[PDB]
Amino acid sequence: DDSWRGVSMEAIHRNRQPFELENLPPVTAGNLHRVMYQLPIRETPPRPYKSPGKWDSEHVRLPCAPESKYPRENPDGSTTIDFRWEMIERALLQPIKTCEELQAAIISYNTTYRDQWHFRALHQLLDEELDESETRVFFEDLLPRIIRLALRLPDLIQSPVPLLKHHKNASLSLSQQQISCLLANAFLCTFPRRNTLKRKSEYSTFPDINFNRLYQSTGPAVLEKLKCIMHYFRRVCPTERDASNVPTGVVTFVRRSGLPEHLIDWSQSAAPLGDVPLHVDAEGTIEDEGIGLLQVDFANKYLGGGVLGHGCVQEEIRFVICPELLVGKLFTECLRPFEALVMLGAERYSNYTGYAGSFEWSGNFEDSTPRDSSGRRQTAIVAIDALHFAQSHHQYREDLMERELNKAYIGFVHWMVTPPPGVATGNWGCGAFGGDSYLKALLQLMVCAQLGRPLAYYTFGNVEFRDDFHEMWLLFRNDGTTVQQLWSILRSYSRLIKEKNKASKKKLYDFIKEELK
Ligand SMILES: [Cl-]
Ligand SMILES: [Cl-]
């Protein structure tokens, strides 16, 4: 009569309370860890760290930077070159009473995009979705708050914000407050040099950050993501009265970049697959039931995927109910094959129903997840990007099974002295992305086996698959099957499929009871 099979949740936690095992070391400022606030944290919210600003190829181009210049065409037809931040202030402190004036204000410092940008999702939310009185509240209450917060960027960010590039193991930690400010800037499309669509541009290996592409999109899932974002700002912006609602803590972003040294040779892993404490659940979610665990983000190589766009599946949804993740887009270069991004601290602000086109904001969430010693909520998320397959069969290539093993490997490494909590994951890169649920569950088990991590796997309503995966773990447990041995069998399946879901699991049966004599 239970939703789950395999080992129990208490067991995934080693019969120790959730949150006793940590997923990241404490924040310390170092050569490889930049921290945007003063350590140790005395006052809350954390006090900003002060150092000389940077306008260069190694750091975020901040909208408030004195180096940021902009041409303005004037009434009289002439050019004035001015400081773009000063133009931004002037635009955003004019009164703004309608959606057309908001767009015109934003365009006034983005004039290149005058006839390319149209904020149709914002027009749809404010002119068609909301009643006259909720729209008046957006322009009299919320938008003024977002502007005031955006304009405090030079007060809240007083040190350079580094980019987390390719092939560099590095961490960045910011206050939730600092992130709210950066995001208010993105909402108002203020980030310089991050708008061009030209193919071989400065930041073309970085995700989008200005919210314009969200505003350009259509359909109800998009309006619902806007509602999540509106709500985030209502939660985290100071009210006219007081700033007591402003979030108190910290978020840490860690780029994991594996060296060739770190690559596992999978045909040498002597790790027994059945020794993995496996908990497979057909109800529940990673974000709810996976507390204390390393929760997986079924990521795009560009962090956040199409969250600022039409995207509304597992990654995008997590980035709008926990919007502080969005700031990763500002500074995180796209993930190479042996890289991952760990995100610890992101507060949840919203509840939701549905998935893809049915996705809806369904109310306020008051996150009471306890904070670590560093002031981070103990919500640890790893972004690992699966491959997409137009052709299902391609994924059975040995090279692309190994690519996925190694992607999940770099995501799931621990590299701490204390022992690792379990991973909370599910159907990674499956459904419409082409991944085989059955294969991807095994790859994830192989990785967890090898690293000595429990695995809580969520099948999101699929009892059938819960059982086939549980059953295969039992078969490995009392056959004492090993990683290198399942790898061997999996390589066999590679060469069989090159001649031509439920079939991957039938052939292991076969290549496994042939051993049983
Ligand atoms: Cl001006
Ligand atoms: Cl610009």
Numbering used by the authors: 26 to 525, 533 to 549
Copy out sentences from the published article reporting this entry, exactly as the authors wrote them.
The main enzyme responsible for degrading the bulk of PAR chains is poly(ADP-ribose)glycohydrolase (PARG), which hydrolyses the acetal bond within the ADP-ribose polymer, but cannot reverse the protein-ribose linkage. We further show that while Drosophila lacks ARH3, there is a striking evolutionary adaptation of dParg that confers functional equivalency to both human PARG and ARH3. The macrodomain is extended by a highly structured and conserved accessory domain so that the overall domain is composed of a twisted, mixed, ten-stranded β-sheet flanked by two predominantly α-helical sub-domains.
The comparison of the dParg with the mammalian hPARG and mPARG as well as protozoan tParg structures shows a near identical active site architecture. The position of the catalytic loop (loop 1) is isostructural in the compared structures, while the diphosphate-binding loop (loop 2) is known to undergo conformational rearrangement upon substrate binding. Loop 2 appears to crystalise in the open position and closely resembles the apo mPARG structure. Finally, we investigated structural features adjacent to loop 1: two loops located within the accessory domain were identified that both support loop 1 positioning as well as accessory-macrodomain interaction (termed AD-loop 1 and 2). The loop 1:AD-loop 1 interaction is stabilised by an extended water network in hPARG. However, these interactions are notably reduced in dParg, while AD-loop 1 is absent in tParg. Our structural data revealed that the active site of dParg is conserved with respect to mammalian and protozoan PARGs, hence indicating that the difference in activity is not a result of an altered catalytic mechanism. Together our data suggests that the ability to cleave the Ser-ADPr bond relies on subtle structural differences surrounding the active site that may (dis)allow access of certain substrates.
